[PDB]
Amino acid sequence: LAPLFGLEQDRYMTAQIFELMGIKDTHKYLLPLEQYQPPEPSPMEILQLE
Amino acid sequence: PVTAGSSSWVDRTVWESVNGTLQDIINVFCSGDEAVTFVADNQQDSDAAD
Amino acid sequence: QTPRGMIQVNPKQLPARHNLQVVVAISPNEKAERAQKLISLKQLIAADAQ
């Protein structure tokens, strides 16, 4: 079921959770999805690929 | 204080009752580190409640 | 704290009561429980790499 349950879903979920107990997650706790831009590949990843 | 021979002592229900309920109101509302904490419905304004 | 320095928040900029839930009669130790909630949330969020 992971294929559906990716990133956004997870963040929403977790948030909700938080939002029940610790509210303002947005900006001190968990980076907002709009800005959670994917990581650049490492030199170790790249050199092993080539 | 009805008459000199009557030994007009007076009971203190009312007083032992008030201090009772007062004991508990203070224990409940003035006990905490704080009086109140606001809470928001949205992460949009969570940063203001504080 | 982000720049660490009084932001003169035009108060009128604030939200309305409409949006605001208030609570009273806080436990003197709400701190500790909030903290344990946070560390539990932390173990959790660490558990999932996504």
- Amino acid identity of A49? L
Token pair 């560390």 in the structure block, residue: C39
B50 at A interface, C-beta within 8 A: yes
- Tell me how far apart the alpha carbons of residues A12 and A18 are, in angstroms, rounded to a whole number: 10
H or E element, residue C23 = strand C20-24
| Continuous segment of H or E residues that includes residue B38 | strand B36-40
3-state secondary structure of C5: coil
Nearest to B39 by CA among C11, C28, A22, C30: A22
Which tokens in the block code for residue C43? 């173990």
Strands C20-24 and B36-40: antiparallel
Distance from the Cα of B6 to chain C's closest Cα (Å) equals: 48
Distances (CA, A) of C42 to A11, A21, A29: 14, 13, 10
Give residue for tokens 């559906």. Answer: A4
CB pairs under 8 A between B and C: 45
Q: Angle at CA A32, nearest 5°, toward A28 and A38?
A: 120
The DSSP secondary structure of chain A, one letter per residue, reads -TTTSSSHHHHHHHHHHHHHHS---TTTTS--GGG-PPPPPPHHHHHHH-
Structure tokens at B20: 């009772």
Name the nearest CA neighbour of C21 among A29, B36, A13.
Answer: B36
- Cα torsion at B16, B18, B20, B21 (round to 10°)? 160
